[PDB]
Design a protein around this ligand. Structure first.
Ligand SMILES: COc1nc2ccc(Br)cc2cc1[C@@H](c1ccccc1)[C@@](O)(CCN(C)C)c1cccc2ccccc12
Ligand SMILES: COc1nc2ccc(Br)cc2cc1[C@@H](c1ccccc1)[C@@](O)(CCN(C)C)c1cccc2ccccc12
Ligand SMILES: COc1nc2ccc(Br)cc2cc1[C@@H](c1ccccc1)[C@@](O)(CCN(C)C)c1cccc2ccccc12
Ligand SMILES: COc1nc2ccc(Br)cc2cc1[C@@H](c1ccccc1)[C@@](O)(CCN(C)C)c1cccc2ccccc12
Ligand SMILES: COc1nc2ccc(Br)cc2cc1[C@@H](c1ccccc1)[C@@](O)(CCN(C)C)c1cccc2ccccc12
Ligand SMILES: COc1nc2ccc(Br)cc2cc1[C@@H](c1ccccc1)[C@@](O)(CCN(C)C)c1cccc2ccccc12
Ligand SMILES: COc1nc2ccc(Br)cc2cc1[C@@H](c1ccccc1)[C@@](O)(CCN(C)C)c1cccc2ccccc12
Lengths: 232, 79, 79, 79, 79, 79, 79, 79, 79, 79
């Protein structure tokens, strides 16, 4: 009956790649790039802002207030662009699931966060970034000892377990959440149509809020992990 | 295979039972503080959001990491 | 098949057991804050429903996912 | 059949166990706030029944859905 | 029969275990508010029994319905 | 019976397990309010015992009913 | 005998599992009120031991009765 | 022996599972009042260790007795 | 292994069930104090994060340590 | 062994399930008082670490002792 782990795979460089996930990641990237070029054309400081300017201003002021509260914009200015792109890129990648792309069952487009490779690309990039930023501020060897010491030096094994748990939590929370939605839509499609639409619309409506809340959790927790890596 | 398949369904059912308990109660306990804070300060709804979604993100990890491993047990069993 | 069928029914029963514990207690704990908030400020009711239905919506999302996976186990068994 | 029937009785027993845990604690936790608000202000009783019966409606619903799936498992076994 | 009778005894045991957990904790949590209300205001005793017996009636309904389904399982087994 | 007796012992063990969880936590939660009432004003000690023994009477009753149905299951097994 | 003996060890293990959950949480919840009374009013220690040992006597009675029925199940098995 | 041995390991596992739930939650709930007492009354750190170690003594006695009966089940099995 | 693999899946499922219960509730209970502290004092967030992430560090370590022992049971089974 | 080894994995899984429930909730409940103390009394963070690590040491002792007995059950099985 059901299927879940399958992908439209290809070999690109001896490495095995998914055609789905990658095209969905490309569509999310192209939508975010197009929306950013629309801002670059239409942005006004003198004249009253349009909706796309109001959107990026609301996200930028929100993520700036978080960076400024957590660590300071003078210390960590590179975290603001990263928090903004993490939010907007996850948000669009999640919200593309609202499209009616299911058919007799298969979908023309998976949400990219239903693939472990996508969430590892985001989480392991963020992990390398806050450790590299943490080293550039806490020292090459000074940083690694502060990761062990934490706030209470006797807890050093628990502090090491926290540093291992962060990239795994970022990965598997985002994956497990969007992957759950991917399983729910195929088991809802076991209903006949006269009734299928009601559980489907209930799920897709809450999956818009959940898809936005995910994007926000990943962006907030990214800013906090930068603040912990750059403290003292 | 059939004894392993029953173990996968019972083991997977445990993972989702403990996930829903942990996260459903954890979100009720976290959201109780949001509703109480806004009740003390109506205008503080926006302020609590950040602490609230930090808390919900930590609680919901226990659900969704469990859901990843339940799905592994029932769709792609470790044995 | 009968071993897998018993595992599906026990596994599906665990999923809805943990579902009702998580949801019933999570909703009771969130609703305790709504009742206590409307005790403190009668005019806050309409505002307190935003924190409450955010909290209950997150708790009920976990119940709806558990309900979906129990239905999968018993009507469309994964193994 | 006997293995499927025992799985249905254990599975149905889990569903109603988690149902009464979720409902009994959810209702006790919700009603604790009603009793506390009527201790604080005797008249409040008329306004506090709205937050209370919203909460009790959500908590009962988890009991009634579990009761319906237990009844399905033992009287009309899905497998 | 012997497999179904053992499953009925374990299934009925689960129903009464979850019934007593839900009821004993639900009544303790409801009664904690009654004792705390009579602590703060002695003259409230009479009025507090309406919120209390509304809450206890909901908790005791979940116990009695579980007790009825346990009795069905072990004396009048559904299969 | 070897199989029915094992199900009767596991079923009876579940009944007394959930019985003691419900009882011990219900009594601790009710007694926490009694101790906190006598802590805030000791002149209340004579009045608080009616709310307390109403609460403990309900919590104990759930223990005694579980203890009676465990005794039925192990000494006078329904099959 | 081995099937009945395994049922007696699992059933006996459940009785002592539920006893320690009930008692350890019930005593922690009662003792939280004792510690909080002595924090706020240091002279109250002597009077609070009456509400405390009334509470703890009820909680520990559930533990000791469970310990007695576990001992019956494993040493003096009802079948 | 092997079916009794599986029952001894599952039975002993239940005893230490319920032991650690009773202990860890009982100790956290007791210690929450100790930490809160030293927060409010900064000179109360001392007097509080008597109510705290009375509470922890009751909670840890349930853990040690469960540890003793688990050791009996797995090393010196009652059957 | 057919039976050892089923025992590994049920055992690994238990490890992750208790992991998510402990973690989801422990984080919700810790985050309730963060949300309430930032509700009462908006500038307190920065000082409250340190206690919060010490607490969340201990709670998230428990679940993750379990996640590692579940992975041992199901991928590299001790028998 | 298929039976003893499966009983060891289920028994060891129960030990670590109850371990993580007791630990995660005990640490969350203890750290809730630490975060609340650093909220209300901002100077207290030095004095609160003694009550906090006394409480966490008691809670983590139950987890580590459970981990030691799970390790015994699966690597060095008592029977
Ligand atoms: C508040 O209700 C919801 N909120 C949600 C929020 C998010 C998501 Br993603 C799913 C949600 C789903 C629902 C309900 C719903 C309504 C309609 C169709 C399907 C599901 C619900 O699941 C509630 C269960 N709770 C109360 C225990 C339900 C299920 C089954 C039977 C019901 C019978 C009666 C009432 C509700 C019933
Ligand atoms: C408050 O009552 C409700 N509110 C609900 C709210 C939402 C939904 Br969707 C379902 C609800 C259902 C009910 C009851 C009901 C009334 C009539 C028929 C069916 C169900 C109930 O389920 C309550 C159980 N509680 C109290 C543990 C019940 C079930 C079975 C036997 C009962 C016997 C006596 C009384 C109530 C009985
Ligand atoms: C308060 O009592 C109730 N309130 C209810 C409220 C709603 C509903 Br719908 C059912 C309710 C049922 C009852 C009792 C009752 C009284 C008479 C007959 C049947 C049931 C009860 O179930 C209480 C159990 N509690 C206390 C754990 C009970 C059951 C069995 C044996 C008892 C022995 C002694 C006393 C009570 C006994
Ligand atoms: C408070 O005591 C009660 N209140 C009740 C309230 C309602 C109902 Br309907 C039954 C109630 C029953 C009792 C006791 C009782 C007293 C005498 C005979 C039978 C039952 C009890 O059940 C208490 C168990 N609790 C404390 C865990 C008990 C049972 C078994 C052995 C006991 C040994 C010592 C003490 C109490 C013992
Ligand atoms: C407070 O102690 C009690 N109060 C009770 C109250 C009511 C009833 Br009816 C029985 C009660 C029984 C006891 C103890 C007791 C003392 C002596 C003999 C038998 C039982 C106890 O059961 C306490 C267990 N708790 C603490 C988890 C116990 C059992 C086993 C071994 C123990 C070893 C050391 C200490 C206590 C030990
Ligand atoms: C606070 O840490 C402790 N405090 C204790 C207090 C008392 C006693 Br008697 C034992 C204690 C043991 C420990 C840890 C420890 C540290 C070193 C070796 C062995 C045990 C711990 O058990 C903590 C588990 N908790 C957090 C769920 C642990 C176990 C296994 C793997 C870990 C990996 C990373 C970190 C901690 C790890
Ligand atoms: C506070 O410690 C106690 N208080 C008690 C109070 C009453 C009674 Br009657 C028994 C008590 C027993 C103990 C310990 C103890 C100390 C020495 C020997 C035996 C038992 C303990 O049981 C604590 C377990 N807790 C913390 C989960 C323990 C058991 C096993 C291994 C341990 C290893 C390290 C530390 C403690 C260890």
């Amino acid at each position: 009956q059901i299927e879940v782990g399958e992908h439209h795979t290809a070999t690109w460089l001896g490495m095995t790649v998914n055609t789905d996930t990658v095209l969905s990641t490309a569509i999310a990237g192209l939508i975010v790039i197009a929306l950013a070029f629309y801002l670059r054309a239409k942005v006004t400081s003198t004249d009253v802002p349009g909706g796309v300017q109001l959107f990026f201003e609301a996200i930028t002021i929100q993520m700036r207030n978080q960076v400024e509260s957590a660590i300071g914009m003078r210390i960590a200015p590179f975290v603001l662009p990263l928090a903004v792109t993490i939010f907007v890129f996850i948000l669009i990648s999640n919200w593309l699931a609202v499209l009616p792309v299911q058919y007799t069952t298969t979908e023309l487009l998976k949400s990219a966060a239903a693939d472990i490779n996508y969430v590892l690309a985001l989480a392991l990039f963020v992990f390398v970034c806050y450790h590299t930023a943490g080293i550039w501020r806490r020292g090459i060897v000074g940083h690694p000892i502060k990761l062990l010491k934490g706030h209470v030096t006797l807890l050093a094994p628990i502090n090491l377990v926290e540093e291992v748990a962060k990239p795994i939590s970022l990965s598997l929370r985002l994956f497990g959440n969007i992957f759950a939605g991917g399983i729910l839509v195929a088991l809802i499609a076991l209903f006949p149509p006269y009734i299928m639409w009601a559980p489907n619309a209930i799920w897709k409506a809450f999956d818009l809020f959940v898809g936005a809340i995910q994007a926000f959790i990943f962006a907030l927790l990214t800013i906090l992990y930068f603040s912990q890596a750059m403290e003292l | 295979d059939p004894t392993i398949a029953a173990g996968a369904l019972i083991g997977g059912g445990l993972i989702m039972a403990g996930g829903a308990i942990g996260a459903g109660i954890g979100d009720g306990v976290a959201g109780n503080a949001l509703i109480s804070g806004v009740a003390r300060q109506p205008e503080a709804q926006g302020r609590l959001f950040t602490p609230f979604f930090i808390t919900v993100g930590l609680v919901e990890a226990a659900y969704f990491i469990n859901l990843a491993f339940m799905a592994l047990f029932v769709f792609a069993t470790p044995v």
